[PDB]
Amino acid sequence: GRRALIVLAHSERTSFNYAMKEAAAAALKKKGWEVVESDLYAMNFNPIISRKDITGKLKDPANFQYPAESVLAYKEGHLSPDIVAEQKKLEAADLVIFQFPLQWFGVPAILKGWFERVFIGEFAYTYAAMYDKGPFRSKKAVLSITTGGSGSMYSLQGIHGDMNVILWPIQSGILHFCGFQVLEPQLTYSIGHTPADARIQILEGWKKRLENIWDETPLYFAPSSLFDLNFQAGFLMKKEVQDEEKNKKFGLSVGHHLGKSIPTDNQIKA
Amino acid sequence: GRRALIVLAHSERTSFNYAMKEAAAAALKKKGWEVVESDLYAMNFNPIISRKDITGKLKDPANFQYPAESVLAYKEGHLSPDIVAEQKKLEAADLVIFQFPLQWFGVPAILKGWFERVFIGEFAYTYAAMYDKGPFRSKKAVLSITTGGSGSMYSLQGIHGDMNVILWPIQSGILHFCGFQVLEPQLTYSIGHTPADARIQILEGWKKRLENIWDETPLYFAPSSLFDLNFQAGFLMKKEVQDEEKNKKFGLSVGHHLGKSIPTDNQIKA
Ligand SMILES: Cc1cc2nc3c(=O)[nH]c(=O)nc-3n(C[C@H](O)[C@H](O)[C@H](O)COP(=O)(O)OP(=O)(O)OC[C@H]3O[C@@H](n4cnc5c(N)ncnc54)[C@H](O)[C@@H]3O)c2cc1C
Ligand SMILES: Cc1cc2nc3c(=O)[nH]c(=O)nc-3n(C[C@H](O)[C@H](O)[C@H](O)COP(=O)(O)OP(=O)(O)OC[C@H]3O[C@@H](n4cnc5c(N)ncnc54)[C@H](O)[C@@H]3O)c2cc1C
Ligand SMILES: Cc1cc2oc(=O)c(Cc3cccc4ccccc34)c(O)c2cc1C
Ligand SMILES: Cc1cc2oc(=O)c(Cc3cccc4ccccc34)c(O)c2cc1C
């Protein structure tokens, strides 16, 4: 009996995206998960960080710094009721599903803001315990994305280039960075040009995947241990590590590709 | 003379970003440029896609689809007046500058939403002429970014990983997709640790660059001519091209790395 959070980001109950989340929650429940949702549009959600994210007095209103004030606000418990109720949903979850349409090659603005407003220092990340040492280490996150263009268009020779680089800033920068383990993305390509019968199976496969999803092995990111964590060493990869790698033909990651070959589907397949 | 448009996405008049936007406008004016602004936060820009973007009447309100509904609104002149004003600024502009702090390894949610509401199909991109043949092919954009992390953290060895991969979805996907000639990003690392006297230098270096911006050499992107531009062919790289690259050490760019080694600083250097 674990705990799932489904974050949607689509205006229409009409959308395949909405179907995807409804399918997501049904599957989850019949296997006994308790499920909570953040339907951003339906929530009248405000996606813009500002001082107004802070209940009371600002430490230094003369020179507003979002990072420090929000953190303080988080500690003293002075955050817009808004943010508070989301942050709670998070700590309570084991799994977090992010459901969205790909918009300009990343997350919708409203989803982006949700990260920016909900993922507050101390609560979600730490400068000390960055990445795989994050507060979310006990949790798993996954992107379920739908797309206009085809797998072909997003393949190594496709006009849009590799979908793995496009996934990187989000899956690593935003999910792994907070500690999350990230499962392979669910990618629904060319959803506008999928015959009506494939679209009924896709929803079904998604539901099957969900039945055993806690047991999947996650995407691979280069451990934080491979790096010297300070401004002295530059947060750089240890010499001993940079050395074992001299003769390995593939980089470690998309981000840590090292001028070498990116390991096939590093951001798409475990 | 020539025209610039400076889109800014920071809330504080006291920030280095606002300062940076000022310097650009200042320096650019002293050359003869006509400078226009979008201080997103000051304009209280609405960043959220919705049916309220179409003033007219929906072709198909039952199952609402933003792409086609918005593109039709475009053609007929039924786009919401605030979006329209933004688009007139883009038409007029020869050079567009995006000034912002890197937030969660990308663009502030308000800038994302600005792209989503204002880059409407057929106004800003053509499915029949994606990328280098796009509407804005006659203009030039540049990203001006400030960061918390140091450049070291964003080197091939840095904990955050190659900054070129991070710049990719924005420079190719958002800017270049529209036809933009993308110029080298102005990268200001860890501005919040930069000695007071140092920040003045950066500020004036920025003014110095802008003196001769229009003659810069743009970042390199695979020309669309390398690809068969139709869905039947999967928008795959041309057969002849694929062969005449089989014996090339390096990929074409970050997205078209072809599973080989990425060329150094492809999203950072011309
Ligand atoms: C602003 C914007 C930016 C975009 N950027 C990109 C981009 O960068 N790259 C890219 O590749 N694409 C892009 N597209 C994204 C593409 O349109 C979306 O990623 C995708 O369309 C999301 O699909 P949807 O949920 O809205 O599908 P829908 O519009 O809802 O359509 C899905 C199909 O499934 C049907 N359907 C609906 N519900 C069900 C159900 N319950 N059961 C079975 N079938 C159902 C629908 O009738 C429809 O035929 C962009 C679109 C927009 C508006
Ligand atoms: C939500 C969020 C997410 C972030 N995510 C990331 C991330 O993913 N990766 C990352 O590396 N970083 C991240 N940071 C990014 C980092 O905060 C910004 O890039 C950086 O803070 C931008 O500085 P600023 O202009 O906003 O702030 P400021 O502190 O205002 O920068 C200006 C500095 O120069 C001084 N100054 C102001 N005006 C002038 C002037 N005219 N001349 C000289 N000095 C001046 C100011 O006092 C200040 O010391 C994040 C920050 C936030 C809030
Ligand atoms: C930033 C952006 C990227 C996109 O990428 C895409 O692949 C598609 C799908 C697509 C784009 C162009 C031609 C097509 C042809 C057939 C099927 C899908 C096609 C988009 O509709 C699309 C829309 C926007 C706003
Ligand atoms: C998503 C995110 C990424 C970040 O990356 C960074 O490199 C820094 C700067 C930074 C990060 C970690 C340790 C530091 C130590 C000293 C100075 C800056 C330091 C961020 O403050 C930061 C903040 C957020 C929200």
- For B21, B91, B218, B257, B263, the CA distances from A161, given in Å and listed in that order, are 32, 28, 19, 8, 15
Experimental method, per PDB record:
X-ray
Report DSSP letters for B190-218, one per residue. Answer: TGGGS-HHHHHHHHHHHHHHHTTGGGSPP
Residues in chain A: 270
CB B149 within 8 A of CB B45: no
What residue type is assigned to position B106 of the chain? Answer: G
Q: Does B253 touch chain A (CB under 8 A)?
A: yes
| CB-count burial class (<10 Å; 0-12, 13-18, 19+) for A7 | buried
Determine the Cα–Cα distance for residues B216 and A126; give it in Å rounded to an integer.
39
User: Nearest Cα to B251, choosing from A245, A257, A219?
Assistant: A257
Structure tokens at B219: 């970042």
Determine the Cα–Cα distance for residues B19 and B26; give it in Å rounded to an integer.
10
Partners of A236 on chain B (C-beta within 8 Å) are: 152, 155, 157-159
Determine the Cα–Cα distance for residues A99 and A8; give it in Å rounded to an integer.
5
**Ligand with the closest atom to the CA of A229:** 4
Determine the Cα–Cα distance for residues A28 and A35; give it in Å rounded to an integer.
7
CA–centroid distance, B172 to ligand 4, in Å, is 25
What residue type is assigned to position A248 of the chain? Answer: K
CA–centroid distance, B101 to ligand 2, in Å, is 6
Rg (CA), chain A: 20
Residue contact A236–B119, C-beta within 8 A: no
Query: Which sign, positive or negative, has the C-alpha torsion B131, B53, A166, B259?
Result: negative
Q: Which fold has domain A1-270?
A: Rossmann fold (3.40.50)
Q: Does B147 touch chain A (CB under 8 A)?
A: no
A115 vs B104, B131, B153: nearest CB: B104
CB B94 within 8 A of CB B4: yes
Task: Decide: B127 in ligand 3 pocket, CB within 6 A.
Answer: yes
Determine the Cα–Cα distance for residues A214 and B156; give it in Å rounded to an integer.
32
Residues in chain B: 270
H-type alpha helices, chain B: 16-29, 66-76, 81-92, 109-118, 163-168, 196-210, 239-243
Residue contact B162–A105, C-beta within 8 A: no
Partners of A162 on chain B (C-beta within 8 Å) are: 255-257
User: Nearest Cα to B159, choosing from A259, A253, A22, A212?
Assistant: A253
Structure tokens at A62: 């003369």
Furthest C-alpha separation in chain B: 59
Q: Does B230 touch chain A (CB under 8 A)?
A: no
Report DSSP letters for A92-126, one per residue. Answer: H-SEEEEEEE-BTTB--HHHHHHHHHHS-BTTTB-
User: Nearest Cα to B11, choosing from B37, B34, B38, B40?
Assistant: B40
Q: Does B98 touch chain A (CB under 8 A)?
A: no
Partners of A106 on chain B (C-beta within 8 Å) are: 106-107, 112, 169, 173
B-chain residue closest to A45, CA distance: B48
Determine the Cα–Cα distance for residues A78 and A222; give it in Å rounded to an integer.
36
